[PDB]
Amino acid sequence: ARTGAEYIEALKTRPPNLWYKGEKVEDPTTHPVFRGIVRTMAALYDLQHDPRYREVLTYEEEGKRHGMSFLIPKTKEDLKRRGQAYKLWADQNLGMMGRSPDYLNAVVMAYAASADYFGEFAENVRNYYRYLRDQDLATTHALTNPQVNRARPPSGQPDPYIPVGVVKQTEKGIVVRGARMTATFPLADEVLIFPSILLQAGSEKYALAFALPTSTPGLHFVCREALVGGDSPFDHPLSSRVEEMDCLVIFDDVLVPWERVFILGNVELCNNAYGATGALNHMAHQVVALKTAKTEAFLGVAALMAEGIGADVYGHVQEKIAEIIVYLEAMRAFWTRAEEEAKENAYGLLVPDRGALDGARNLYPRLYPRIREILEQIGASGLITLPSEKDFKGPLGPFLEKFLQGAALEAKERVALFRLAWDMTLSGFGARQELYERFFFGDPVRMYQTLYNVYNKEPYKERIHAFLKESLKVFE
Amino acid sequence: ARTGAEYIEALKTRPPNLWYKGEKVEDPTTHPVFRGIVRTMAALYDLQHDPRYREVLTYEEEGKRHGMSFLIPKTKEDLKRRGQAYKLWADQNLGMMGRSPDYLNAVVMAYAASADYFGEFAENVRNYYRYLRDQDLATTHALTNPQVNRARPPSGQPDPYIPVGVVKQTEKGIVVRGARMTATFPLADEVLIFPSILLQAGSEKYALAFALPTSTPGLHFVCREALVGGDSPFDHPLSSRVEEMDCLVIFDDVLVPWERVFILGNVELCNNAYGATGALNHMAHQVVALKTAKTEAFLGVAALMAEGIGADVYGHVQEKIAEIIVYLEAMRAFWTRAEEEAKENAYGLLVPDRGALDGARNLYPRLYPRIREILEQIGASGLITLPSEKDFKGPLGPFLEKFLQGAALEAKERVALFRLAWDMTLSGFGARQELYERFFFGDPVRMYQTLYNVYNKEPYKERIHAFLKESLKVFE
Amino acid sequence: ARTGAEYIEALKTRPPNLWYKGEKVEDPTTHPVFRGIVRTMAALYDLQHDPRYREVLTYEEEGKRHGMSFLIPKTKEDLKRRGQAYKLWADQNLGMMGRSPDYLNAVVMAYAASADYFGEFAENVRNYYRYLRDQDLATTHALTNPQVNRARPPSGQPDPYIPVGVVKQTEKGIVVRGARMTATFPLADEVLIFPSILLQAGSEKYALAFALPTSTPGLHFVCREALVGGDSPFDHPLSSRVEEMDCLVIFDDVLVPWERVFILGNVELCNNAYGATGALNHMAHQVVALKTAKTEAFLGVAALMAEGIGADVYGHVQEKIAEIIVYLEAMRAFWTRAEEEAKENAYGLLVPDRGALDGARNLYPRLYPRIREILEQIGASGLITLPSEKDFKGPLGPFLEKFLQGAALEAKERVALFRLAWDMTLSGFGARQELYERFFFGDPVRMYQTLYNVYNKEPYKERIHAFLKESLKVFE
Amino acid sequence: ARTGAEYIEALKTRPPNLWYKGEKVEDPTTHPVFRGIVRTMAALYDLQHDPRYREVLTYEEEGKRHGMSFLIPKTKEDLKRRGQAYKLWADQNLGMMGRSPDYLNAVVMAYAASADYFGEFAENVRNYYRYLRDQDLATTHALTNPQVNRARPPSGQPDPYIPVGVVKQTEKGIVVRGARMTATFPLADEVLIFPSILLQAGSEKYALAFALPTSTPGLHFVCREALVGGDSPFDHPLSSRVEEMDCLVIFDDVLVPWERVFILGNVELCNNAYGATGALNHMAHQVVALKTAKTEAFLGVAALMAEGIGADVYGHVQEKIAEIIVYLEAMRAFWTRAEEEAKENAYGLLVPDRGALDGARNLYPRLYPRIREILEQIGASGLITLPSEKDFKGPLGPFLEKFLQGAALEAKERVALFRLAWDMTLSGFGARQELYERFFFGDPVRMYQTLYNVYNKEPYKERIHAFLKESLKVFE
Numbered sequence A, B, C, D: 001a002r003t004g005a006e007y008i009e010a011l012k013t014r015p016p017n018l019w020y021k022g023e024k025v026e027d028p029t030t031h032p033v034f035r036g037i038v039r040t041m042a043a044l045y046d047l048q049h050d051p052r053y054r055e056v057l058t059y060e061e062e063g064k065r066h067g068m069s070f071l072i073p074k075t076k077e078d079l080k081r082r083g084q085a086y087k088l089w090a091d092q093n094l095g096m097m098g099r100s101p102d103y104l105n106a107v108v109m110a111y112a113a114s115a116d117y118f119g120e121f122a123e124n125v126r127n128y129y130r131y132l133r134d135q136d137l138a139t140t141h142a143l144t145n146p147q148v149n150r151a152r153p154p155s156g157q158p159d160p161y162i163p164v165g166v167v168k169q170t171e172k173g174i175v176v177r178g179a180r181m182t183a184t185f186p187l188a189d190e191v192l193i194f195p196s197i198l199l200q201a202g203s204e205k206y207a208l209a210f211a212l213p214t215s216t217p218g219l220h221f222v223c224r225e226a227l228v229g230g231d232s233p234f235d236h237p238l239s240s241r242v243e244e245m246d247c248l249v250i251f252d253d254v255l256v257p258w259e260r261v262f263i264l265g266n267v268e269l270c271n272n273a274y275g276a277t278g279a280l281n282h283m284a285h286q287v288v289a290l291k292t293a294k295t296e297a298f299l300g301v302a303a304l305m306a307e308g309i310g311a312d313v314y315g316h317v318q319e320k321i322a323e324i325i326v327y328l329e330a331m332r333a334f335w336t337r338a339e340e341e342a343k344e345n346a347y348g349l350l351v352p353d354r355g356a357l358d359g360a361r362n363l364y365p366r367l368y369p370r371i372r373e374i375l376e377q378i379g380a381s382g383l384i385t386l387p388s389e390k391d392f393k394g395p396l397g398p399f400l401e402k403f404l405q406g407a408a409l410e411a412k413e414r415v416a417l418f419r420l421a422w423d424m425t426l427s428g429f430g431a432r433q434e435l436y437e438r439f440f441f442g443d444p445v446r447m448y449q450t451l452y453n454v455y456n457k458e459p460y461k462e463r464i465h466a467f468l469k470e471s472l473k474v475f476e
C-alpha cells in the first residue's frame, strides 16, 4: 500500500503528459490547477496507514499489505469489506470525487479473477493486476469515442482514425492512433483504454483493451477549463481540493507493448467484457457506496441550511429534506441487496447482484438533479450572498457579522456553510457534478434500452398469461 | 387455519352490518356487489391447505396450525417466512388486493408481542391476538376521522361526536358514538378501530383503540358506489373478483365490552402505538412485499402489451419498460434491507428496519402514478378498443379476429390482455387503485413531515461541521 | 340550424350501424348506453335556438341560419365569433365532450375554403360542406389504422386489408375494405374517413379521404365497454349524460359513391391535407377553446372541494389550485395569440396562428394529467366516500347528513360535489378522459418529432452564429 | 437618452460604493470584475443612438428624446412599443442580463403615472421619474430583508435594525440603518429601496420606499464571489461580458433626503404599491419579453448543438428541442395576451393583463430548469470537453481540429458553440442563471399562495354550483 508521499513523488518524477491552455504541465503536484486534487489523492493513500482505518482500507497477504479495492472477494463478508473501504474513502470528500482509483481497481480485480475470459491475453491481465496492486498505482480511464458524428458508427466518422484504432502490429506490440473523448482524474500513473460498457465496438480495428503509463510518448491529455475557484477553504471548500479535471486523450501513433494488450480485434470480447468478468458488478458496487456517501453529504448540508436560517419550521422545507432521506434509504437498500444477493459468476468470481446495482445506477442519475434542486430551493438567495473570508477580515467585517448571522448561528459559520452548499451545486465545480451524475456511467437513453434487453422479463409475462387463462376460458 | 368454506359460512351466518344504496345487505356471499371479493378471500384461505404452499402459508404450534401472518418472529429467518407468505398471497391477485387480512394480523401480532405497552389492557391485547389467530378470522380497520373541517382538530368539528368518542363508561364497557371515514374490505368478521398512525389523537375523548365483531348492534358500514364492472372474467378480469369495497363506518351508541378495549383516554399511548410496538414495521413489511408483487404484475402486462402490438421495437417503449424494472428492483431492495437490518425493539420483538420501510412506503406512492402512466403511454388507443367476449361470440366475431389480432398474437388473447391492462388502470376499479396507492398509508404531505421529524439527521450534520472546520480555520 | 328534436328523429329513423356486446343497436335514442349522450347533443342543437345565444351560435346568410362552426371566417372578428361558439358549447358539458361536431365542421369548413387543394375532387368537397351546413348534420371520424403490428407500415400488416384500402373502382364509385381503429361519438349522421394528421399514408391503396352516412351497408361501428355509471345525475353527474362512446369501424366491402370521394390514391395530398387547407389550424382552434373550458371546470371543482372540507387553509392546497390557474391562463394565452396572429393561407383562408396552437395542443396533454392529479391530492378519501342519493333517502340518511357535512357545507351538497369530482377523474368515465387528453390529437412522441421538423428554427440558430462571431475572432 | 460614453464617465466620476473581497472598488469601469458588464450596459445605451434602432429604443417629446422604458403608454400600440424595446435590448445579451435598467424604469414609470397613490409624496415620485428619464440614469434595487431567521417577522430578528428601519426623522430627511439581502447589477447611478412585492412590510419602522445615489455616504454594496471566467470571448462568451454581480446592501445610518422619500411608515401603502400602481404589470411585461428572448437563445443553441454532433437524427433529441419550442410559444402567447387584454387601472394608467403575466412569471420558473436540463442532455460530454482558444493556438491545435470537429462543422466553431452552451448552463455564471430564474420574482411557494388569494375564482365555482343543481334536484 502506497503512502501519499510516494504518490506525490511518483507524479513529480514521471508526470502524466498533461496539457493546460496550450502548455505542457511540468509538475502537477505544484501546478495551481492540479496541486489541490493531488494533495487529496495523497491524503486517501495516507489514510491507509492510519491505525484507525488500516484494517478497513487494507488487507495483509503473504507479508504484504494491499489496498482493499484489490481484494478478490471469496465470501459476502469480503464483499462487505470492499464496500466499507469504498465508503470510507468516499466520505473523506463528501462523495464529490467520482473517479478515485478504487473504482478502476474493482474493474481490474474482476478482469484478473475472470482472466480466462481474455484467452491468450489472460496472463497479461493477471500480471497487470498484480502490478497495480503491488505498487498501489493510481489509474484513470477513457472508454468513449470522440463526439463528432453520432449519427454514424465509429467506422463512419470523418476519418478512420478519429476513434482509437490499430495502425499496425509489430514484434514489440501494436501502434494505435486516434482519441478518446473523456478521461477524468488524469493525475494517475496509468490509463486504462478499455471497451465501452454499453456500446458496441463496431469494427475490429477499434476493438481494443490495453493499459499504458500516463507518460507514454505520443500520449497526450488535453485538459478542459479548470474549475478550481481558488485555494481558500472558506471561499472554495470543495473546488480548492476535489477538482479531478476532465481531458481529451490523444494517441499520436502510440506504441502499446504486447504485455499491456488485453483484447485485440475481437468485437465480441469487447462487447461483453464487463458483464462476463463481473467488472460491471464490482465497479457499480463502488458507485452505490459512493452515491450513498454523496447523498449523506447533501442531507447534512440541507438540514444545516434549513436550521441555520430558520426555514426548517416550514412544512414544505421539512418535506424536501425528507425527500433526500427517502433517496438516501433507497441507495442504502440497493447497496445492501447487492451484497446479500451476491453469487459467483461463470469464472467463480463472487459478484454483487446486478439487479440491485442496475437499479441503483439507473435511478440515481434521476434522483441527483432533484437532490441538487432541493438545496437550491432551501437556500434561495443565501446561496449567492457569498462574501469572502476577506470581507469578514476587512473593514465591513463587523457589519457582516450582524447581517449574515443565522438563527442561533454565527455569521462566519453561516457563510462557510452556504459557501459549501454553493460549491456543491452552483459553482462551476458544483454544476459539473450534476452533468457528471447524469452521464458518467453512460447515456441514460441507452442504459435503459440495455436494461430492457438484458433483463429476464419472462417470469412476469408468464404470470400474466396464467392469470389470463380464466379470461380465455369463456370461449370454451 | 381457516378454509374458504368456513369463511364463507361465517359471513353468511353472521354477516357484517353492510348497507348498499339504502338497503341492508343480507348475504354478502351471494350479493352481486360482494360475492366476487368474498370468493377471492375464500380462495386465499383455501391456499393455506394446498400441500404445495402449506409450509409457506402456515406454521404448526402445539398441535395447531396457524396462518403465517400470526407468527411472532424470533429470527430473521422467521421474518423472511412472514415475507414469503405476504408475497404468495399478494401474487394470487396481482397485488391488487390492498387490504387482505395479513396486513392487520401483522399489527395485532406486534401489539401482542409488545403487549406491555398497553398497561392494564395488556391481557386484552394478548387474548384478542390468540382469538384472531386460533379462529383465523378476517379483519378490516378504520383509523381516520370524517373529512368535515380539516382546518380544525377532532374536538373542533361541527359536533363533538362526528369523530368516534366515548359517551360514557359502565360496568360492561364503554359506549361510543361517531364515525370513521374509511374502512376497506368490510367482508370481515372483525373491525379494528385503532388510533391514527401519523396524526395526533388530540383529545382523551377520542383516544381509543378497540375491536368489535362486524355484526355489533349499532355498527353500520355504508358502502360507496360499487366498482364491479361485471362477472365476465374476460370483460372484467379484476373488478369481477378483487373489488374490496370502501365504506364509511357509523357508531350509533355502540357498546364496546371491556375485554375488547386496548387503549382508553390516553393520547400519548395512541400517538406512539404503532412505532413503540413495532406494528408500523410489520405492517409496512407486508406492504413492501405487496407492492413488489403489484409492480411485477405491471411489468408483465407492459411487456406483453408492447410485444403484442409490436411497439417493443421502439427505444422509448423499451425505456418505459426498463423504468418499471428499476422501480421493481428498488422495492425488492427495500424489502431485502428491511429484513437484513432487523433488530429487536424495546419489548424484545424483532422488527424489520424502519429506515428501509419508511423509504419504501414514502417512495412507492410517487412511483405508482408513473407506472400507471407508462401502461397508458404504451397501450394508447388499444386501451379503449375493448370489445366484449360477447362481440367475439357474435356475428362480427370473424372481423374482430382479423382487425384486433396483434403481432403474432391472436385477437382474443390480445383483447383479453388489453382488457386486463384497462382494468388495472382505467376502469373505475383501476383508477381507484391509483388514489389508493397515493393515500392508503397516510397523506404524503404529513408522512414526509413525520419522516423529517423522527429521522436522526445528526450524524450527517456532524460530518458537515467537521468538514467545515477547515473553512473556519482561516480566521485563526 | 337543426333543433334537438330533428337530430333525435334523424337518429331514430336512420340510426348508425352500431353494435354493443354482440347485438345491433336498433334505437340509440332510447338504448340505455346511448340515450344520455344523444340527449346531450340534442341539447347543444337546441341551444342554437335560444334567443340568448342565437347570435353567438348561428349566423344568417341569404335567408338561412347556419351553425357558427360552418362560418368561413374573413376577418379576425369572424375568427373570434367561431371561438366564442366553441366555448359556449364546451361550457355546457364542462369541456367533457371531446368530439362534439363543431370540431369536424371546422375541418370540413377549411377543406371547402381551400377546395382547390383537392383538384378534380374540389367540387365534391364544396358540395359536401354545403350539405353538412344546410342540414346541420352531426359527424364522427376515424383517422387511424388498426393497432396490430406497429413495427410495420400499413402495407406490412398480417393482411393487406387490415387498414382501409381500395378493393376496386367502378362506374358508381370505389369499394373499400378494412377498418379504422377508433371513432368517438358514433351518434352522428355522417362519418369522415380522412387521412392521418401526422402519419404518412404509405401506399396509394390506403391514401383515401371520403365521407359516408353512418347507416351505409357494410359499415359497422363496434362499441367498447360502456362507461355510463347510471342515470342518476346525483350519483353520476357526467357519465349519465356525456359518455360519447368509442368504437372500432369496420368496412365490409363498402361502396363509396364518387361524389363522396375527396382524395384517392394520392399519398402526397393525404400527407399535407390538414396543413395546406388550414383544417389543422381551425380544428386546433376548437380544441384550445375546449381545453380552456375544461380547465375552468377543474378549477371550479378544486376550489369548491378545498373550501368544502376546509383544506383551503393549507398553503400547499392553495398552491395546487394556483397551479391550475397558471395552466388556465396559459391556455387563454394560446387562444388569444392564435386569433390575434391569424393570417391567410395559400388559398386565401384566414387561419389561426399555428405556432400558438401547436404550443397549446402539445402542452395540454402534459398539463392535464397534473390537473387531474391535483384534484386527487386535494380530495383524498373524500373522492371514494361516495354514498348514493339512495343512501341519503334511506334509513341512515340522518347519520350521513351529520358525518358527511363539510365546513359550512351541507352533506348532500358535499357528496354531490365529490361525486362530480370523482366522475371527472376516477370513475371509468373520468379515467378515460385522461387517456383521451394524452392521445386524441396523436401520439406525443411523434407530435413532438413533427413539430421539430416543421418549425422554422433558422432565425434562432442565426442569432447564435452572429453572437459567436466574437468568439471566432480571437483566431484572426 | 444617454450614450455609453456618458454612462461610463458617470460611473468613473461618481462610482457606486462597491466592495470586493475586503477592498473598496475605486473604478468599476476598469476593475477586472466589473469592466465587462459596464461595457455591456454602455453598449445598450449606445444602441439607442444607432439609426436602425432609434425609433424602437427612444421616443421624442418636446425637443427631447427619452429611452422607451420611460414612456407612459396611452394605447395598446404604446404598450407594444415598450415591449419591442424590452425585446431588442434583451436580444443583445441572449436574455442573460436579468437586471437591465428598463425593468426598474417600468416600475418608476408606473409609480409616476399612478403617483396619487403616494399621497403627500406624490410630487417626489413624479419628480424622481422625470429625473431618471431626463438624465437616463441606470438603477439597481433591493427589496428583501436579510435571510437570518425566516421563522420570525422583520421585527423579530436578532436585532431591530437587521432589516432597513427608520432610526429618526429630521428637518432634512430620515436616517435609516439595516441591510437589504440582494441587489443585482450595482453598476448603477441610483438604487431603489422599495417594498417587497409579495411579502408584508410588518412594522411601520420598516415600511419604506426611497431612492438614493449609489455613492451616498454610509451606503455599501458588498459583492459576492465574482463569476467572470475570463476575458476571452471564445473561452467565456457570456461571463466575460454579462456578469451583473449580486451584493448585500448595507445602510450605516444613511441620511435619505425628504425629496427622495416615496413611502414612510405606511404598511398598507407598501403592501399594495406594485399592484395598485401597475408597476407589477409593467415590470412583468419586461420580464415576459426578456424570457422570450432567453428561450429563443436556448432554442438556437440546442438546435446547433444537436445538428453539430449529428444527434438531431435521434427522435428523443428532436422531441427535446420541440419541447423548448413549445415553451417558447407559451411565452410568446402570454406576452401577446398581456398586451391585447390591457386595460387602464384606477389611476388611468394602461396596464398589461395581470392574468397573462401572472401566468408567465409563475410558469417560467418551472420551465427554465427543464430547458437547462435539455441542453445538458443533448450536449452530454461535449459540454465539458472544453479546450481553450490557447489549446487551438498551441502545438496540439492540429490534433484538436481533427478530434473535435463535428458533423460538417469545423472544430473551432464546434468548441466555440459548446463553450457557449456550457457558459449558459454549467459555468458558475450559467448555474447562477438557474437559481436566478427560480427566485428573482419571489419565492414560488409564496407567489403561488399569493396568486391563489388574489385571483377571482368565483365564476368557476358558480358554474359548478349551477351544474350541480341537477344533482340536488333528485331530492325534491
Ligand SMILES: Cc1cc2nc3c(=O)[nH]c(=O)nc-3n(C[C@H](O)[C@H](O)[C@H](O)COP(=O)(O)OP(=O)(O)OC[C@H]3O[C@@H](n4cnc5c(N)ncnc54)[C@H](O)[C@@H]3O)c2cc1C
Residues within 6 Å of the ligand: B309, B311, B314, B317, B377, B378, B379, B380, B381, B382, B384, C099, C141, C142, C143, C144, C147, C150, C182, C183, C184, C185, C246, C432, C435, C436, C439, C440, C441, C442, C443, C445, C446
Ligand atoms: C379516448 C380516445 C379517443 C380517441 N378518439 C379518436 C377519434 O374520434 N377518431 C380517430 O381518428 N382517432 C381517435 N383516437 C385515436 C388517437 O388519435 C390515437 O390514440 C393517437 O393518435 C395515438 O395513436 P395509436 O393509439 O395508434 O398509438 P400507437 O401508434 O399504436 O402507439 C402505441 C405505442 O407505441 C409507440 N409507437 C408506435 N409507433 C411508433 C413510432 N413509429 N415511433 C415511435 N413510437 C411509436 C407509441 O409512442 C406508443 O407508446 C382516440 C384515442 C383515445 C385514447
Ligand SMILES: Cc1cc2nc3c(=O)[nH]c(=O)nc-3n(C[C@H](O)[C@H](O)[C@H](O)COP(=O)(O)OP(=O)(O)OC[C@H]3O[C@@H](n4cnc5c(N)ncnc54)[C@H](O)[C@@H]3O)c2cc1C
Residues within 6 Å of the ligand: A309, A311, A314, A317, A377, A378, A379, A380, A381, A382, A384, D099, D141, D142, D143, D144, D147, D150, D182, D183, D184, D185, D246, D432, D435, D436, D439, D440, D441, D442, D443, D445, D446
Ligand atoms: C441570482 C439572484 C438574484 C437576485 N436579485 C435580486 C435583486 O436584484 N433585487 C432584490 O430585491 N432581490 C433579488 N433577488 C432576491 C429574490 O427576490 C429572493 O431570492 C426571492 O424573493 C426569495 O426570497 P429569499 O431568498 O429571501 O428566500 P427565503 O424566504 O429566505 O426562503 C428560503 C426557504 O425557506 C422557505 N420559506 C421562508 N419563509 C417562508 C414562508 N413564510 N413560508 C413558506 N416558506 C418559507 C422558502 O420557501 C425557501 O425554501 C435575487 C435572487 C437570486 C437568487
Ligand SMILES: O=C(O)Cc1ccc(O)cc1
Residues within 6 Å of the ligand: A143, A144, A195, A196, A197, A198, A199, A440, A441, A442, A443
Ligand atoms: O462505456 C461507455 O460507453 C460509457 C462509460 C464510460 C466510463 C465509465 O466508467 C462507464 C461508462
Ligand SMILES: O=C(O)Cc1ccc(O)cc1
Residues within 6 Å of the ligand: C143, C144, C195, C196, C197, C198, C199, C440, C441, C442, C443
Ligand atoms: O391522425 C392521427 O394520426 C391521429 C388523430 C386522430 C384523430 C384526430 O381528430 C386527430 C389526430
Ligand SMILES: O=C(O)Cc1ccc(O)cc1
Residues within 6 Å of the ligand: D143, D144, D195, D196, D197, D198, D199, D440, D441, D442, D443
Ligand atoms: O419583493 C420580493 O419579496 C421579491 C422580489 C425582489 C425583487 C424583485 O424585482 C421582485 C421580487
